[PDB]
Design a protein around this ligand. Structure first.
Ligand SMILES: O=c1[nH]c(-c2ccc(N3CCCCC3)cc2)nc2ccccc12
Ligand SMILES: [Zn+2]
Lengths: 47, 161
């Protein structure tokens, strides 16, 4: 893995074009996330 | 050391996780190429992931980050989709789970939009889709996402397309 930018612990990807998109985030240390919930699902075919 | 505890659909905890999953679906600029064509999910199961060693590893790092950032971990709940979700729940996140070719460099990626993480369930760009039907828009096969506690600390803001 790469390093976080100096003086930072993560990167936030802010959308600058698609007004409806929410943010995405990047961490560079596996210890900075805990997998709290496992969700099992299907995508649904639109009617 | 991981155990999985089923949540009842009557549990407020199940319901708040389902609502975050459903309410953060959006349309994608690929028209559904990577993740499939859908507006909502059929939630089949929500399990709590319990591993004391992995939790202590998380909270140890969280304290380090908080102490470097005026006692503020900047903790979020975020989605992660990956073909290696089974490995993650047993062994934790590490460099093997990084997206080397990601827009913000080789790190581990998380999304506010559940549908963004859904694009990665079968690999980068949806890979070749589900293992059984080779369909990135498969409506039959069971998919899995993680809803994760993530420490951001001081986060570098990247404005991007
Ligand atoms: O949930 C996400 N997963 C992934 C993701 C990307 C790549 C991978 N791998 C796992 C290790 C093998 C090579 C690629 C696993 C997960 N990328 C995202 C990018 C943006 C927003 C969300 C995600
Ligand atoms: Zn399938």
């Amino acid at each position: 893995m790469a390093h976080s930018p100096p003086g930072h612990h993560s990167v936030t990807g802010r959308p600058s074009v698609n007004g409806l998109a929410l943010a995405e985030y990047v961490i560079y240390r596996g210890e900075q996330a805990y997998p709290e919930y496992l969700i099992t699902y299907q995508i649904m075919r639109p009617e | 050391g991981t155990i999985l505890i089923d949540l009842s659909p009557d549990d407020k905890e199940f319901q708040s996780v389902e609502e975050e999953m459903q309410s953060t679906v959006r349309e994608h600029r690929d028209g559904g190429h990577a993740g499939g064509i859908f507006n909502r999910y059929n939630i089949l199961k929500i399990q709590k992931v319990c591993n004391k060693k992995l939790w202590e590893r998380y909270t140890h790092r969280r304290k380090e980050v908080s102490e470097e950032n005026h006692n503020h971990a900047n903790e979020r709940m975020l989605f992660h989709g990956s073909p290696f979700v089974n490995a993650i729940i047993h062994k934790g996140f590490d460099e093997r789970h990084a997206y080397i070719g990601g827009m913000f460099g080789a790190g581990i990626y998380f999304a506010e939009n559940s549908s963004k993480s859904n694009q990665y369930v079968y690999g980068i760009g949806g890979g070749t889709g589900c293992p059984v039907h080779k369909d990135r828009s498969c409506y039959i096969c069971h998919r899995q996402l993680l809803f994760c506690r993530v420490t951001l600390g001081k986060s570098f803001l990247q404005f991007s397309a």
